[PDB]
């Protein structure tokens, strides 16, 4: 049978043109008042995963190209 892809991984991770795995930075959904604009700038970007985490995400995606 076909292998299903992981739903959370589908919704959370992207794969770039060069095979890099990127996610959205965590920690900016709420409780933003005490955070400086510098902290929000650090948390508003797009993070590139480490090699091990990227391999795990690629295993979780059943060939799904990411969101």
């Amino acid at each position: 049978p076909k292998m299903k892809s992981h739903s959370g991984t589908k919704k959370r991770f992207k794969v770039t043109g060069s095979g890099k795995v990127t996610a959205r930075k965590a920690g900016k959904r709420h409780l933003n008042e005490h955070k400086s604009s510098r902290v929000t700038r650090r948390l508003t970007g797009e993070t590139v995963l480490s090699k091990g985490e990227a391999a795990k995400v690629k295993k979780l995606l059943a060939g799904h190209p990411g969101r």
């Binding site: 965590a26 900016k28 959904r29 969101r67």
Partner: protein, 96 residues
């Protein structure tokens, strides 16, 4: 992950949405057009770019990375501004 909140839970969900009616433009470049129609392709068409390679039964947008030293009449579905500018500079045209 051993009980630690796993990456696929700690990372925030990329939100957004998908366009239900999004169409994807098969793209051909001026490098490829020049290479596959070197003898000054007079009137290239969707069928001609398909017999070369455009993956037919799709819209056949033409993009403009290249030089296009020849004169060519593209007759395709949509084109980029730089591609159009290069085409009229070389002396060709686009249609549709």
């Amino acid at each position: 992950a051993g009980g630690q909140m796993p990456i696929h839970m700690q990372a925030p969900k990329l939100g957004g949405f998908h366009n239900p009616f999004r169409t994807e433009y098969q793209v051909v470049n001026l490098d490829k057009v020049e290479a596959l129609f070197p003898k000054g392709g007079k009137i290239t068409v969707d069928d001609l770019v398909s017999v070369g390679a455009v993956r037919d039964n799709e819209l056949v947008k033409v993009l403009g990375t290249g030089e296009l030293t020849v004169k060519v009449d593209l007759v395709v579905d949509a084109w980029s501004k730089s591609a159009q500018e290069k085409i009229e500079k070389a002396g060709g045209s686009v249609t549709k």
